[PDB]
Amino acid sequence: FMSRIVYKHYRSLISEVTTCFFLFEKGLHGNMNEEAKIHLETVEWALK
Amino acid sequence: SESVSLITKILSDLELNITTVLDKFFQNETQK
Numbered sequence A: 001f002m003s004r005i006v007y008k009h010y011r012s013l014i015s016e017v018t019t020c021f022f023l024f025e026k027g028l029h030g031n032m033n034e035e036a037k038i039h040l041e042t043v044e045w046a047l048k
Numbered sequence B: 001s002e003s004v005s006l007i008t009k010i011l012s013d014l015e016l017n018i019t020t021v022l023d024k025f026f027q028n029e030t031q032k
Helices: A010-021 A032-047 B002-013 B022-030
Strands: none
Touching: none
């Protein structure tokens, strides 16, 4: 995903994307948008 | 991606090191 090399198994590509995912510091999930969206989803399910 | 990987491997294997008056400047700069 970030080079012109080729892997032998796609577990390696899964791990590459996983590593790129954990470079984003925890606490971005503490943004107002995420709490708003989880509240909205819970309230929508309750209404349904 | 496969093409660049194959030719990159070939080029990498192609660089691994293997186990008169003009002559002065030649040996100092070009031959060295």
